[model samples]
Target: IRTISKIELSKIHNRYNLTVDFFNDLNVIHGKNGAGKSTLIHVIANIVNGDFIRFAFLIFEEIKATYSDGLKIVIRRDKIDEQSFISVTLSNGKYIKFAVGEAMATVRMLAMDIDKFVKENELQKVRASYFPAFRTMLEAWSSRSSFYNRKASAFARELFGQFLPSINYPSPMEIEDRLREEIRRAQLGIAAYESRTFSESFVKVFSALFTGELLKEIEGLAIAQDSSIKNGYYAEYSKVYEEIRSLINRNNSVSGALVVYRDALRDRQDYQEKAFSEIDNYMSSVNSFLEDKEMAYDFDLRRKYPKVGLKFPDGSWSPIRVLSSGERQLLTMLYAASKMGDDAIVLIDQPEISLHIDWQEDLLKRMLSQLSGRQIIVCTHSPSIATGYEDFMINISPEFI
Candidate 1:
């Protein structure tokens, strides 16, 4: 995995030099206003994503990132080749140096080579999930109309797209439709089986009279007298021989029908299992939080159109969209957090956005419990959010812990 072990920022905000190490699964960075805490977070996001233009705009003299694979990236603000932007120099001697308004396609093509080089060295591609502050969430989901915050919104939405289900997540109603279709197909098979069984039984009745009725009158007379067999009377004298053959054919037909019915039933069951299995892990994580509040996300594949509902303890429920803004924000944050892979680096900005104090105090612990192996860097102003996790705090300078 390609993870940042430590970062050294030189002359950020034109003064403070920030150096920090991410030595644990969870890391917290806090500081006073204008102490360059948020700047550090945003700069880290830019560096990880290889956002050349945005990294250039941030006011920093030099920044060096040390990765877990012993590779390093250095970003420094300078004027190179008539461009007023930062130069991103890779440890492998590859540098991203281009003018401010050059063709983006050309610059990106060169960056792609650097990306491959990282992989050639056997390092995982950097995928840092950054969740920005509160107003930005509304902005990204709502108007999305701020130039300074435009880049932040882009990264947040990009991560949200990866984590949250949008456009591609199979809805419960779709599953229901699939389940019903499977049942219908099974019904069609059963109809054929029953029809075939009926045809075999009904059509053979005429044959049964000649063979079956006569067999009762003259029981296995072919066996009764071997002398009769010696005189060639087996087929004609007693009809038991033909009746036995007919019963054997019927038994074979019934056995085949039994196999067909069993196969169809199992196919129906497997279809349902696959649908529930794909969604259960994700749904449970979100529901874990809502359970404490007497509300839950209810999913029933039996429903039509909207298959997701928010249920109250009173047994009343409504569409998930009826949730309050705070509720939506919480859902958005936690749901995205739950999607991170093991060894993933998650950057959460201002987690207490719409949450009250009680929610804030319990947030870190909750995340720690569920996401034990993930690397999390939370940027927040609320002490409640960082309450219990004091040992993990990154104190950049005298301004704050």
Candidate 2:
């Protein structure tokens, strides 16, 4: 994670001898939008990673500018390239030569030769392999808001849908149907009811009489069971049929309560009906696939939080139709970051979208804090993020002749 310290350009197109120093902690490069600030950042990225040469060369080539031989670029690296070394004559008639690589040449050479070294030296195994794991690599000169938007959506789905059980708990439709059938037969006084109830109309009367008699008998049995009974003596006798019957009743009460609770919270009927209606209305309003994709998705508000939903076990996320813009953004960010392991490079663009200014600032702080050990590069227009660190800034200016 070494960053650029300085960039030196010799006689490269309008570049006469320019040296730029970058601080490691926080570097602030502030200027107008088109003041080449992004260019300066890209140039720094290229110099350090050497992966931006092709793009940089194309840009300079289109403008008809060619680099010179006496280019001497310097930055923080252990080794220096041969082509970068040049001799200089001073006004006092002294000659001095320093071994270095030009900013553009450093990146260009890296782009050309590093692949062979990486393979031969097995650098990829030791070092995380890929360089410039930042979002700026997605596009040479575009803002990264779109990338962030994608990540946020994926995040929301993972949290509420995949990581935690959905709000609609115990949707066990199969169990509910089976239990309902059993209850229905019980209500209709099926043959199984006779064993438990004696007869339908006599159930209450029999319960009263039987309960009273059993209560008295159980009290007597308790007295007998506890008196002079050694631990192993009544081990076989300890299997009291009366006690087992009492336990079954207790368990039945608890099971009944659970069934009632599940039924009260079940969203299958009401939510499905409403979601379908909303989808129909949405279809009426949209004319194309693009419009339809943008339309409101079918969702059950009760099963999902307004800001989140579960991504299912099959990797298919559900309740997609009701996602809000903010929730969508959160989903996208989560997905992108998830792809990065402890040493993975996660490039993020404008990580603040559809959020309030305060939330944006909070998100920037939280994201960096959350991703402390991993490698991440973010290109943002938000001054708060740019100014958040001490040396993460870069100022850009047009090249001078």
Candidate 3:
């Protein structure tokens, strides 16, 4: 995995140049309005994701990043064609260029192109997870706390239901759908992994017991039958009594099977524990963060399929959509982080939109705990969220030109 430790833009918006050093675990970018804070986040995400076409409309001289592996990759635009097209070069070779003009709308198609380009050129693969700012619902009402005012919340939902493509944030419906898919996948995996009890249950425990008793009784009866006293040492004692020996061997088959199964059960128990330990930790963090709101998800696999619903103080099964927008946004971001690969570069934009001050203060800690080995880049204007992490803050000052 390649870890990006530094990113530099020769010029952004044709004026300001950005040289930001990112920490391995956490990096906070604090900027004022028009400082290109959000722009930088979007650019970095697409660049790492191999979505080069998204950069054609933007005005930037070049984007460069240094990976911790001592390899640096640069994407520089030296020529352009009209407003719809431009040719950019990758640093893999001097003339390694890609013509950025594709009508690819689906992420899957774009990812396919990226894979082809990278693999044909033998370039390294980079991973990124982007959490664009949740603005519509969070900015809905000032009269109500947490959008408790039903009228204002509904108005905001109806009015801003259509998502803006500029920010590229998924709409509420899209979010809910994806969340369901992710939740189902997670819960199903957890269920299959943790249900080691059914296989090596107590029923099988007594099975071995019965097997032992039957084997012992059969062996004793066979010995009594074979004790013919034709002579002091009977002729059928060792070689002639093959039929009884075969019967005894058949009885031992059950005992051998028990031994093999019991042997594998111990290893299966350990494997199950190892599989869910990370998920258990992530769940603990999410529930802890939602503790104040008195909301939590049921991950115990109580039902057949994985159904995502928040358990409230008074109610047990409130669908995820019923939760306030801010609540959902926070949970979604944290959950995305947890689901990301171990070394992905995480891009989060403006997490403090509808968060309480206390939440802002603790949000970073929660993320760090959940995203163990991933690199995090957070863009925010709130001092509370960026508090005490001054050393990790990257400054992106806008030129007043």
Candidate 4:
């Protein structure tokens, strides 16, 4: 995992020049209102996520970052007579050039196309998730409406969705093969039992019919007790045997079908369990940050409902939709922190919003401990979040504006 060693932002948001050298783990950015604190974080987020559109206007000159792994990435924008272009140099020494037109854009990577470069380098995994100041609003409305209906919630959805573990269930063909193997064993057992029962009954009837004792009885008995009676017995036995055989055949077929369906159901359940495991993993990472806070609440991914909720100490549950605005904000911040990759950067805007002063004091430390090995840059107006970290904090001044 590599960290951001240096970041340089030039000519951004009109007359803003920012440069910051980050610590190994946590870097706090603080400034007065409208001093371009949020703007800085937003631009950094765009650069990390490869969002040239949002960053296009911001980079009138250039934006650059040097990573700890000796890889440097740069973004530059150029304009000709009423035409604009954006060029990006990835850490892997690949150059991506694209035309930024009014309604469309075309991208190319050195000798390869944009899509191929992205696939080959797995660029999507290198991107970071951005949390805007209004993330709590997303939690408020996520359940009632689709995320796509609004821009903020939609971005939130995409960011959170990135952390979900990939689905890894057995294919339908594999499941069918497993079920077939079990059913085959069951059928073999049924066949052997049926064959043995029929053979034993046939031997007993044949012995009784051929023995001299049976012949003597037939001769001494009335006319009804002749060979015809023996023939009737054989007929009845044949009918019973046929009926049992037919029943066994039907049972086998029905049981096989039932077993297949059961296997399918179990497969689905296994997928759900894996999903829940991912959710639990995320929650566990974040819980460490919230353990000592006064407003601490445990998050649970409800097993039966497949939604997130807060679990109280007394075994009561509170849905996320009904949480206080502050609680929601903390929940989302922690969740974002948990989702970040080891080497990826996280840019958070105004994390102090709706948070208590005491909680704000411990926010950065707790996050740094919980999200070890990740570079975190937070924009905050609260002094509690920035006070004790003078060595690790970057304060925006009038000169940057």
Which portions of model 2 miss their true places by more than 4 Å? 1-29, 44-56, 59-114, 121-356, 375-381, 386-399
User: What residue pairs are clashing in model 1?
Assistant: none
- Best candidate, TM-score-wise? 3
Candidate 2 at residue 211, lDDT? 41
Segments of candidate 1 deviating more than 4 angstroms: 80-85, 101-124, 135-306, 339-343, 398-401
Give the residue spans of candidate 4 off by over 4 A: 91-93, 102-113, 143-309, 312-315, 339-343, 398-401
Clashes of 4: 0
Q: Could you tell which candidate, 1 or 3, scores higher by TM-score?
A: 3
Candidate 1 has what TM-score?
Answer: 0.58
Cα error, candidate 1, residue 181 (Å): 18
lDDT of 1 by residue, 43-110 (tens): 76766655444553355578898877787888677655655665677787666565544533342354
Better of 1 and 2 by lDDT: 1
| Lowest lDDT block of 10, candidate 3 | 228-237
Any runs in candidate 3 off by more than 4 Å, and if so which? 79-87, 94-115, 121-127, 134-275, 291-303, 339-343, 398-401
Which sequence of candidate numbers ranks them by TM-score, best first? 3, 1, 4, 2
- TM-score (C-alpha, index-matched) for candidate 2: 0.35
Q: Least accurate stretch of 10 residues (summed lDDT) in model 1?
A: 162-171
Give the range of the ten consecutive residues with the poorest summed lDDT in model 2: 163-172
TM-score against native, each model: 0.58, 0.35, 0.62, 0.56
